[PDB]
Design a binder for this molecule. Structure first.
Ligand code: OGA
Ligand code: MG
Ligand code: NI
Ligand code: ZN
Length: 331
């Protein structure tokens, strides 16, 4: 079995290997990359996502989210308070202000220590989940707006044609902006490209051990667990590496820098934080190997998780028994 310790693997495809996206994902899996839940892909030196980032400041962040924490430094939830719209140029200036800027630090490890010590005492503002793309239309390789769609994959594998669309999302971050522990909708893959700016630190639990994380989360967030049998779908709970190590939960960590891709694999729980002002683009995707994970994915039916239009068909076809209850949670 390849990668039996479930380490995060880093890949350096050549420009020739960068042509066929599906083939390269299957290659990484042949080497055991999925066992970690997360892999890093460094693009060939010849590749670029676009020519420059000099003209992005007029993108609108219609609903910036202030991420307010509750709990203790290693075990907390966050809720998102909606703020007034602002442009990317306004948000960049805000991120670089004295109130929100990255503190002085020695290295990524020092900054990670400062994040876990101090995150709860601040409320950073995240420009998350903005439909759109920063890939140039002429970029033909690993262009996250030109991937094969999940609907087309389901149709190729299963023969059933379904409604729905699959487009990318932009994330504008600042110091301490946080992504809570989650797997993707329907336990899909994700791919994330860090277009510019400061790094993003990731934590990940191997898919084979995801239920260990879930059991810890039920213990640590007991009211949330009574409310919902899949409350991590709410995407609000944080657990630090120190707490994970104290409870014996297997995980790994890695820092993504600008110009790098990350892939999360089906049922790979992940969480993390941004180091300073940055912009990332991410999208969900599927492969043949996903189908079995989609059929087994948990679902939130309490009403909290509320998701896209396109998840309807995935539930309806892959999980017909759950469909009626889940749809009630959507309505
Ligand atoms: O970058 C973020 O805030 C969160 N991204 C992801 O969870 C992802 O790409 O799957
Ligand atoms: Mg602009
Ligand atoms: Ni994710
Ligand atoms: Zn729920």
């Amino acid at each position: 079995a390849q990668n039996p310790n479930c380490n995060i693997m880093i890949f350096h495809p050549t420009k020739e290997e960068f042509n066929d996206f599906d083939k390269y994902i299957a290659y990484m899996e042949s080497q055991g990359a999925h066992r970690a839940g997360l892999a890093k892909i460094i693009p060939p030196k010849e590749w670029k996502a676009r020519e420059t980032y000099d003209n992005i400041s007029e993108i609108l962040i219609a609903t910036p989210l202030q991420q307010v924490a509750s709990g203790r430094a290693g075990v907390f939830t966050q809720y998102h308070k909606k703020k007034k719209a602002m442009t990317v140029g306004e948000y960049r200036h805000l991120a670089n202000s004295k109130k929100y800027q990255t503190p002085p630090h020695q290295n990524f490890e020092d900054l990670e220590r400062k994040y876990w010590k101090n995150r709860i005492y601040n409320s950073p503002i995240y420009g998350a989940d903005i439909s759109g793309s920063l890939f140039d239309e002429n970029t033909k390789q690993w262009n996250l707006g030109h991937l094969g769609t999940i609907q087309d994959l389901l149709e190729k594998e299963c023969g059933v044609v379904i409604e729905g669309v699959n487009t990318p999302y932009l994330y504008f971050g600042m110091w301490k902006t946080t992504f809570a522990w989650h797997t993707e909708d329907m336990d899909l893959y994700s791919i994330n490209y860090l277009h510019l700016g400061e790094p993003k630190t990731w934590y990940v639990v191997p898919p084979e051990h995801g239920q260990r994380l879930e059991r810890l989360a039920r213990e640590l967030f007991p009211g949330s667990s009574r409310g919902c049998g899949a409350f991590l779908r709410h995407k609000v709970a944080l657990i630090s590496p120190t707490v994970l190590k104290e409870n014996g939960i297997p995980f790994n960590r890695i820092t993504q820098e600008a110009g790098e891709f990350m892939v999360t694999f089906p049922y790979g729980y992940h969480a993390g934080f941004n180091h300073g002002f940055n912009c990332a683009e991410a999208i969900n995707f599927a492969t043949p190997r996903w189908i079995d994970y989609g059929k087994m994915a948990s679902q939130c039916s309490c009403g909290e998780a509320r998701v896209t239009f396109s998840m309807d068909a995935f539930v309806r076809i892959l999980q017909p028994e759950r469909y009626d209850l889940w749809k009630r949670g959507q309505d």
